[PDB]
Write an enzyme that holds these catalytic residues in place. Structure first.
Site, PDB file in Angstrom:
ATOM      1  N   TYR A 189       0.824  -1.207   0.000  1.00 46.04           N
ATOM      2  CA  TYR A 189       0.000   0.000   0.000  1.00 46.04           C
ATOM      3  C   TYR A 189       0.858   1.258   0.000  1.00 46.04           C
ATOM      4  CZ  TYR A 189       0.997   0.132   5.038  1.00 46.04           C
ATOM      5  OH  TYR A 189       1.617   0.176   6.269  1.00 46.04           O
ATOM      6  N   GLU A 193       3.557   3.559   2.913  1.00 43.07           N
ATOM      7  CA  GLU A 193       4.148   3.684   4.235  1.00 43.07           C
ATOM      8  C   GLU A 193       3.297   4.579   5.121  1.00 43.07           C
ATOM      9  OE1 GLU A 193       8.093   5.015   3.471  1.00 43.07           O
ATOM     10  OE2 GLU A 193       7.467   6.717   2.228  1.00 43.07           O
ATOM     11  N   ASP A 229      -9.305  -8.236   8.829  1.00 45.73           N
ATOM     12  CA  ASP A 229      -7.973  -8.530   9.430  1.00 45.73           C
ATOM     13  C   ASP A 229      -7.930  -8.159  10.915  1.00 45.73           C
ATOM     14  OD1 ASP A 229      -5.573  -9.816   9.279  1.00 45.73           O
ATOM     15  OD2 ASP A 229      -4.480  -8.160   8.350  1.00 45.73           O
TER      16      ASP A 229
END
Ligand SMILES: COc1cc2c(cc1Nc1ncc3c(N)cc(=O)n(Cc4ccccc4C(F)(F)F)c3n1)CN(C)CC2
Length: 287
Positions: free
Chosen positions: A23, A25, A132
């Site tokens: 994705y 940082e 998640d």
């Protein structure tokens, strides 16, 4: 949604890289004017990504407002990079914590589980699914409070979106029922209840069950009709309420797995005495 069309470095000073991935940082940043600390997640865009999709996603983040969800502050679009400004949690994840402090107490785990269920119940009310729930995605601030982090926006835009599409390959010959399972379909919000169960075990034993087993093997074993849900290793170390909390969260059948709201009424998380002070003790252990 007001995606600011400026440079984020004009309003913030970047202080430290917290983590990264496909994705992008995430940095610790300080508002040059307010002095407030913030987390800045930079998502690397791709040419084929549409500006329409981002807005849809940024509205999802903007509307999602719960105390147990990391607060959304604003967004910036500059030089083909997207920046999401979020609430900052100064103690990192529970994974960052228990890797130094060791196993959490049953009381601390109960407070974490109650806080996560409160956020989970809000996300499911909005017809959303975390996907998640794990110790590495449960954040803690210096006040001892619990915040759910979410990396979902990156699966819908940018490089992660490209890598998923890279794996699916060409979709033109695919049947529509196969197409559904590729857009993350096939299940319900109740998978978050299961993942919280393993998380409770993870917080108690410093590892999820079957952690030392190869990923493929673990995948086959859960699809076997005779699979047994995991359990806490040391039975005596934990109360019957904790063992029951694990038993009911780890229900194999999704149609019989209890909802986040039903789990909020469970004995382990509904007991008085659960408050931020439990994690303040934990953050002290770390010091
Ligand atoms: C002392 O502060 C921190 C120390 C550390 C971490 C986090 C924060 N603090 C923070 N606070 C708010 C947010 C937020 N709203 C969104 C967001 O993505 N993150 C990053 C994050 C969040 C969850 C997992 C990975 C990651 C990452 F990408 F960074 F690796 C946030 N991180 C992550 N540990 C791995 C390393 C040590």
């Amino acid at each position: 949604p007001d995606i600011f069309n400026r440079d984020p470095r004009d309003h913030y000073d970047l202080l430290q890289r917290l983590g990264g991935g496909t994705y992008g940082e995430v940095f610790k940043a300080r508002d040059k004017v307010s002095g407030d600390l913030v987390a800045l997640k930079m998502v690397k865009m791709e040419p084929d990504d549409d500006v329409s999709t981002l807005q849809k996603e940024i509205l999802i983040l903007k509307t999602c407002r719960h105390a147990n969800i990391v607060a959304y502050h604003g967004s910036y679009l500059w030089l083909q990079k997207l920046w999401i400004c979020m609430e900052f949690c100064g103690a990192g994840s529970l994974q960052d914590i228990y890797q130094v402090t060791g196993s959490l107490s049953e009381l601390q785990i109960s407070y974490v589980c109650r806080e996560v269920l409160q956020g989970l119940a809000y996300l499911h009310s909005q017809k959303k699914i975390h996907r998640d729930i794990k110790g590495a995605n449960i954040l803690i601030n210096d006040a001892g409070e619990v915040r759910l982090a979410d990396f979902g926006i990156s699966a819908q835009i940018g490089a992660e979106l490209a890598r998923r599409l890279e794996f699916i390959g060409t979709p033109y010959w695919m049947a529509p029922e196969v197409a559904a399972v590729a857009l993350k379909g096939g299940y319900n919000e109740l998978c978050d209840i299961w993942s919280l169960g393993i998380t409770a075990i993870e917080l108690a034993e410093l590892q999820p069950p079957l952690f030392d087993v190869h990923p493929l093997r673990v995948l086959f074993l859960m699809t076997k009709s005779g699979y047994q849900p995991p359990r806490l290793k040391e039975k005596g170390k934990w109360s019957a309420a904790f063992h029951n909390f694990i038993k009911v969260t780890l229900t194999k059948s999704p149609k019989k797995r209890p909802s986040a709201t039903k789990m909020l009424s469970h004995q382990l998380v509904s007991q008085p005495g659960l408050n931020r002070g439990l994690i303040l003790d934990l953050l002290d252990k770390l010091k």
